Design an enzyme around this catalytic site. Structure first.
Site, short mmCIF file in Angstrom:
data_model
loop_
_atom_site.label_atom_id
_atom_site.label_comp_id
_atom_site.label_asym_id
_atom_site.label_seq_id
_atom_site.Cartn_x
_atom_site.Cartn_y
_atom_site.Cartn_z
N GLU A 159 -0.51 10.28 -3.51
CA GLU A 159 -0.30 9.40 -2.37
C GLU A 159 -1.08 9.91 -1.17
O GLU A 159 -1.06 11.10 -0.87
CB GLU A 159 1.19 9.34 -2.04
CG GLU A 159 1.55 8.46 -0.87
CD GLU A 159 1.36 6.99 -1.17
OE1 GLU A 159 0.35 6.63 -1.80
OE2 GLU A 159 2.22 6.19 -0.75
N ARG A 160 -1.77 9.00 -0.48
CA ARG A 160 -2.46 9.36 0.75
C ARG A 160 -1.44 9.56 1.86
O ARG A 160 -0.68 8.64 2.17
CB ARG A 160 -3.44 8.26 1.12
CG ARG A 160 -4.41 7.92 0.03
CD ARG A 160 -5.42 6.92 0.50
NE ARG A 160 -6.28 6.47 -0.58
CZ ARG A 160 -6.09 5.36 -1.27
NH1 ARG A 160 -5.06 4.57 -1.01
NH2 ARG A 160 -6.93 5.03 -2.23
N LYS A 176 -2.19 -4.22 -2.81
CA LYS A 176 -1.19 -3.69 -3.73
C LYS A 176 -0.07 -2.99 -2.98
O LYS A 176 1.11 -3.24 -3.25
CB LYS A 176 -1.85 -2.72 -4.69
CG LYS A 176 -2.78 -3.39 -5.66
CD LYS A 176 -3.64 -2.39 -6.35
CE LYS A 176 -4.86 -2.10 -5.55
NZ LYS A 176 -5.35 -0.73 -5.79
N1 LIG Z 1 -0.17 -9.58 3.59
C1 LIG Z 1 -1.03 -8.98 4.45
N2 LIG Z 1 -1.04 -9.29 5.75
C2 LIG Z 1 -1.88 -8.70 6.60
N3 LIG Z 1 -2.77 -7.76 6.24
C3 LIG Z 1 -2.86 -7.35 4.96
C4 LIG Z 1 -1.97 -7.95 3.98
N4 LIG Z 1 -2.27 -7.39 2.80
C5 LIG Z 1 -3.25 -6.49 3.02
N5 LIG Z 1 -3.61 -6.47 4.30
C6 LIG Z 1 -4.67 -5.61 4.85
O1 LIG Z 1 -5.15 -4.79 3.80
C7 LIG Z 1 -5.10 -3.43 4.19
C8 LIG Z 1 -4.78 -2.53 3.01
O2 LIG Z 1 -3.92 -3.19 2.11
P1 LIG Z 1 -3.32 -2.35 0.90
O3 LIG Z 1 -2.28 -3.18 0.23
O4 LIG Z 1 -3.01 -0.97 1.39
O5 LIG Z 1 -4.60 -2.25 -0.04
P2 LIG Z 1 -4.49 -1.49 -1.43
O6 LIG Z 1 -3.91 -2.53 -2.35
O7 LIG Z 1 -5.92 -1.15 -1.71
O8 LIG Z 1 -3.59 -0.33 -1.14
C9 LIG Z 1 -4.01 -3.34 5.23
O9 LIG Z 1 -4.37 -2.38 6.21
C10 LIG Z 1 -4.03 -4.69 5.86
O10 LIG Z 1 -4.87 -4.63 7.01
MG LIG Z 2 -2.46 1.55 -2.16
#
Ligand SMILES: Nc1ncnc2c1ncn2[C@@H]1O[C@H](COP(=O)(O)OP(=O)(O)O)[C@@H](O)[C@H]1O
Ligand SMILES: [Mg+2]
Ligand SMILES: Nc1ncnc2c1ncn2[C@@H]1O[C@H](COP(=O)(O)OP(=O)(O)O)[C@@H](O)[C@H]1O
Ligand SMILES: [Mg+2]
Lengths: 460, 55, 458
Positions: free
Chosen positions: A182-183, A156
Site C-alpha cells: 500500500e502506498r 479502483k
Molecule cells: N468517482 C470519482 N470522482 C472523482 N474523481 C475520481 C473518481 N474516481 C477516480 N477519480 C480520480 O482518480 C484518481 C485516482 O483514482 P484511484 O481510484 O486511486 O485510481 P487507481 O484505481 O489507479 O487507484 C483520484 O485522485 C481522483 O482524482
Molecule cells: Mg489503488
C-alpha cells in the site's frame, strides 16, 4: 531461553542454526534482538542439519552473525475479534496508529486450511452496493468474489472506498481492508476519509506498505484473511477488500527469487498458481457465515494475459473493467458496461426483469457504437427517425450510469447519492421505453436516482 | 455523362480494392517473418536466463 | 617466482609466494617457447593465486612454467617521439623502423580528470557534409559517435571527417584501430604517408587477428597518447575505429574470469568498463580532445545493451541505417535519429535551428504516411499530403552527397558543401521553390545549384 544462532545474513534472508533436537517447523516464527529493537523471522525452509532459512519481517540492517535467536513455537499469529475494529495494524498485528495496545482477547495463526467442499453452502443472495452500474451490469452474491480490473488512475481505490462506505453505513456490515503493498499516501488518505465519513468504527485495517521487505508485503493478505475469518465464525457476513492482487503476486515473485527457487514463465515464481489458490480458497461462504470479497487487480500494460491477471481470473465470479477513456470523458465510475460481466447474470437468479433490463441496456449501447461511425461521416441527419431515437436514448443511458460518490465529494464538492436496485432497474427500464424522451441529456449526468433527473431538468 | 461516370467509379473502386487486398496479403507475410523472429528470440532469452542462473 | 597452474583460453592462473603476490593490473612475463609473453593480472584470488589475461597467443603454454613479476603496469611510449609511427598495444614499434626514441613512458591505467578541471566550448566545427552539420552539428572539443550496423558506411564517413578536419587542422592527431581489418589500417597508413601528413598522426593498432587481450587493452593505449598530447597544452584529434570491439573483448574474457553472465550474455560490468574509458576522453581547461568514434550495432539492434549504454556518453550521435543505404543514398544517415547537443537556437542561430526542425517535421510526417501508402496506394492522399510526400522524397535525395574518399566506389568526384550553402538549399526545398524539378535532380549533388543544373540534363 534462546537456542539458535544466526549463521548468515544476505539482504533480507537470514539463516539460523539450532540444535538438531529443536529445529523450528516451517512457517514458525523466530525472534531476535536487532539492536535496541525486536525483529521476527518466518521460517521458510528446513535445509540441512539444524540450519533453517528464513525471511526477516523488518529491516535486516544491524544484524550480526552469532546473535541469539529464540523460536516462538507457533506461526505468526495476530489479534482478532471486535477489538480490531477501527485500528490499523501491520502484518504482525501491531498497531501503527499510535492509539496504544489493541486490547484483543484471542490470537489466531495466519496459516490455516481452507474449508472442505462439504462445509460450504451455495446461497445466491445478491449484494446491494448502491452503485447503479455495478448492481445492474455485474451482480455478485454473498460469498463470491469481484475483480476491479483496469490500468492506473481509473478508480479502483476510490470505488473500493465507496463500496466500504455504503456497506458500512446503509447495511451496518463489518469490513476488513488488507493493503497488500500500500502506498502510504493513499493509506493515510483512506484513514482520514473513513474517519471523516464516520465509518471507521466498522472497518479493521491492515497495511503492508511498499517500503517494507517482501515478506511483510506477502503475508498481509493472510492477516486480513484471518481477521475476516474470525468475524465469520461469529456468524457474521463480512466483506474483505484486497487492495491489489498484482502486488501480492509481485511480493511472491520477490520472495521466491530471494530463496533461490528456479523461476518460471515470465520471471514469476513456480508456485504462483498455488499461492493464488492458498489465498483465494479461504474466501468462501460456509454454513455458519460468509466472506464476500472485492479485489482490485492492476493489469500491467493492458494485456490481461501475463500470468498475474491471467491466473486470478480462474477464481472471480464477476469482473468490472474500468477504462481510462471513459474516465477522461468525465463519466465516473468509469465502468465499461460492455466488457464487465458476471456469472450470476442469468434469469434463474436475478429474475427476468433485471436480466432483460441489463441485456436491453447492453444492446442499446452496442448499437450506438455502430451508429457513431455513420454519424461521423454522413452527419446525423442521414439517420432514420428511429435511429436518431436510439442515439438520443443511448446517450441518455450513458449519462445515467454515472453517479456521484460520497467519498468523491472531496474531489468535486458534489454530495454523494446512494441508489437502490429498484430505482436502478426502474430508471433504466423507463429510459429504454421512451418515458423520458422529453428531458435533455445533461439532466441525467451525475444525478443519482431517476427522480432527481426530473428535478434537475427543471433547473437546466 | 453522369451515369457513365458513376459506372466508371464503381469499376475503379473494384480494381483499387483488389490492389489493396493484395497489398495487405503481401504484408501479412512480412509481419509474420518479424513475428517468428521475435518469438524465437524470446524463447531463447528466457530459457538462457533460467539455465544460466542455476548454480 | 610464480608458476602457471591453469590455462583456459586467454586467461592464465599464476601462483606466487604468499607475500610476493602482484597487485591488480601489474604486468607479468613468461617465456612461451622462443617468445616472451606478457600477462596483465585482473584479480587476486585467495592463497597467492592471481588471475591474468594473456597479451598474446595463449597456445603453447604448459602448466608449471615460471613467470616473472614485473612490478609495474603496462607502460607505453608517449609524447612527440611517438608521432608518425605504428605501435603495438604494449607500446612496441610494429612498423619495420627502429625503436621509438621516447623520453617518457606512462601507465595505460589512469583516473579521469576531475570535475573541477572540465571545460565547455560552444565553438561550432564545420564539416563539409550536408546531413551531419545540418542535423547534428558538433563543436571543437566535443564527442561524436557514428552508430551503424555492419556495412552501412561508418568507416567511409570517418575517413571523410579525417579528410575535412584532420588535414585542415594544426595540432597533432591520434588514430586507434580497435578490432578492425588490417587491410584498412594498411590502406590508411599509406594514404597518410603518400601525402606527408603521416608525421603529425600517431597510430595504434589492435586489429581483429589478435587475441582478446590486445583488443581489450589497445584503446587505453591510444587514450594515453592522446592524454599526453592534451596535458602538454595542445589540442588533439582522437579517432577510434570501432569502440564496440573494446567491450566485446570483455564479453569474451568475462566468463573465464568467473563472473556470472548478465542481460544478453554481456559481462556484468559492462557499463563500468565502458564508463571508465569514455570518461578520460574529454577536453579540459589545459587542452582539448576532439574525437570521433565508430560504434558498431550488433544485429542492427539499437536497443542492445552495448549501443544503448553508449548513447549517454556522446554529444553528437549520427545513426546510420541499412534501410537507407540499400536505396543507394549515401551517407546513410537517419535524420529522425541523429541528434546533437549543439542544436540550440542560442548556439547555431534561429535560422539553422528552424530549418533543421522543419526537415525533421517533414520526414516524420512522411514516415506516418507509409502504411496507408502501402495499403491503399498513393491516390487516397489528401491533395496536400501528396505534396508532403514529394518534398520528403526530394529532401531524402538532397541529403545525399558525393565524398572524396568514395570516388573509388562510384567514379563521380567528391563535393564539399558549406553550412551557409546547405541551410539555404533546404530552406528552398521546404518553401516549395523547387517543386518543378524531378526527384532524381537531387540525387548525389553538391549544393542546390548543382541540382538546378542536373535537372537540365535530366
Ligand atoms: N468517482 C470519482 N470522482 C472523482 N474523481 C475520481 C473518481 N474516481 C477516480 N477519480 C480520480 O482518480 C484518481 C485516482 O483514482 P484511484 O481510484 O486511486 O485510481 P487507481 O484505481 O489507479 O487507484 C483520484 O485522485 C481522483 O482524482
Ligand atoms: Mg489503488
Ligand atoms: N559516400 C559513399 N558513396 C558510395 N558508397 C559508399 C559511400 N559511403 C559508404 N559507401 C559504401 O559503404 C560500404 C560499407 O563500407 P564501410 O564504410 O567500410 O562499412 P563499415 O562501416 O562496416 O566498415 C562500402 O563498401 C562503400 O561502397
Ligand atoms: Mg570499418
Amino acid at each position: 531461553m534462546a537456542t539458535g544462532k544466526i549463521v548468515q545474513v544476505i539482504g533480507a534472508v537470514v539463516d539460523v542454526e539450532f540444535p538438531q533436537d529443536a529445529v523450528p517447523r516451517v512457517y514458525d516464527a523466530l525472534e531476535v534482538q536487532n539492536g535496541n529493537e525486536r525483529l521476527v523471522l518466518e521460517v521458510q525452509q528446513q535445509l540441512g542439519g539444524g540450519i533453517v532459512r528464513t525471511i526477516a519481517m523488518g529491516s535486516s540492517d544491524g544484524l550480526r552473525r552469532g546473535l541469539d535467536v529464540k523460536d516462538l513455537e507457533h506461526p505468526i499469529e495476530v489479534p482478532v475479534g471486535k477489538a480490531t475494529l477501527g485500528r490499523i495494524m501491520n502484518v504482525l498485528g501491531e498497531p501503527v496508529d499510535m492509539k496504544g495496545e489493541i486490547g484483543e482477547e484471542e490470537r489466531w495463526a495466519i496459516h490455516r486450511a481452507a474449508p472442505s467442499y462439504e462445509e460450504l453452502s451455495n446461497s445466491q443472495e445478491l449484494l446491494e452496493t448502491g452503485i447503479k452500474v455495478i448492481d445492474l451490469m455485474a451482480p455478485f452474491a454473498k460469498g463470491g468474489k469481484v475483480g476491479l480490473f483496469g490500468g492506473a488512475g481509473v478508480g479502483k481505490t476510490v470505488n473500493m472506498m465507496e463500496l466500504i462506505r455504503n456497506i458500512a453505513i446503509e447495511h451496518s456490515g463489518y469490513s476488513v481492508f488488507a493493503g497488500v503493498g500500500e502506498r502510504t499516501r493513499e493509506g493515510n488518505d483512506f484513514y482520514h476519509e473513513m474517519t471523516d465519513s464516520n465509518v471507521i468504527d466498522k472497518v479493521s485495517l491492515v497495511y503492508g506498505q511498499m517500503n517494507e521487505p517482501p515478506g511483510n508485503r506477502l503475508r498481509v493478505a493472510l492477516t486480513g484473511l484471518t481477521m475476516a475469518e474470525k468475524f465469520r465464525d461469529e456468524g457474521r457476513d463480512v466483506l474483505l477488500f484486497v487492495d491489489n492482487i498484482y502486488r501480492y503476486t509481485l511480493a511472491g515473485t520477490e520472495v521466491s527469487a530471494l530463496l533461490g527457487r528456479m523461476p518460471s514463465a515470465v520471471g514469476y515464481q513456480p508456485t504462483l498458481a498455488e499461492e493464488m489458490g492458498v489465498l483465494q480458497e479461504r474466501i468462501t461462504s460456509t454454513k455458519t457465515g460468509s466472506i464476500t470479497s472485492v479485489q482490485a487487480v492492476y493489469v500491467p500494460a493492458d494485456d490481461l494475459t501475463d500470468p498475474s491477471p491471467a491466473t486470478t481470473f480462474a477464481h472471480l465470479d464477476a469482473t468490472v473493467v474500468l477504462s481510462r477513456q471513459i474516465a477522461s470523458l468525465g463519466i465516473y465510475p468509469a465502468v465499461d458496461p460492455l466488457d464487465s460481466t458476471s456469472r450470476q447474470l442469468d434469469p434463474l437468479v436475478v429474475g427476468q426483469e433485471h436480466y432483460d433490463t441489463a441485456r436491453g441496456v447492453q444492446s442499446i449501447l452496442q448499437r450506438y457504437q455502430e451508429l457513431k461511425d455513420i454519424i461521423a461521416i454522413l452527419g446525423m441527419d442521414e439517420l432514420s427517425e428511429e435511429d436518431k431515437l436510439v442515439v438520443a436514448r443511448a446517450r441518455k443511458i450513458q449519462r445515467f450510469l454515472s453517479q456521484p460518490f460520497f467519498v468523491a465529494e472531496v474531489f468535486t464538492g458534489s454530495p454523494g447519492k446512494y441508489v437502490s436496485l429498484k430505482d436502478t432497474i426502474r430508471g433504466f427500464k423507463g429510459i429504454m421505453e421512451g418515458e423520458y424522451d422529453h428531458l435533455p441529456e445533461q439532466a441525467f449526468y451525475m444525478v443519482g436516482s431517476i427522480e432527481e433527473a426530473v428535478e434537475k431538468a427543471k433547473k437546466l | 455523362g453522369v451515369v457513365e461516370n458513376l459506372a466508371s467509379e464503381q469499376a475503379a473502386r473494384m480494381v483499387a480494392m483488389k490492389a489493396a487486398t493484395d497489398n495487405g496479403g503481401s504484408l501479412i507475410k512480412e509481419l509474420q517473418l518479424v513475428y517468428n523472429k521475435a518469438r524465437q528470440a524470446s524463447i531463447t532469452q528466457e530459457l538462457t536466463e533460467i539455465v544460466s542462473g542455476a548454480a
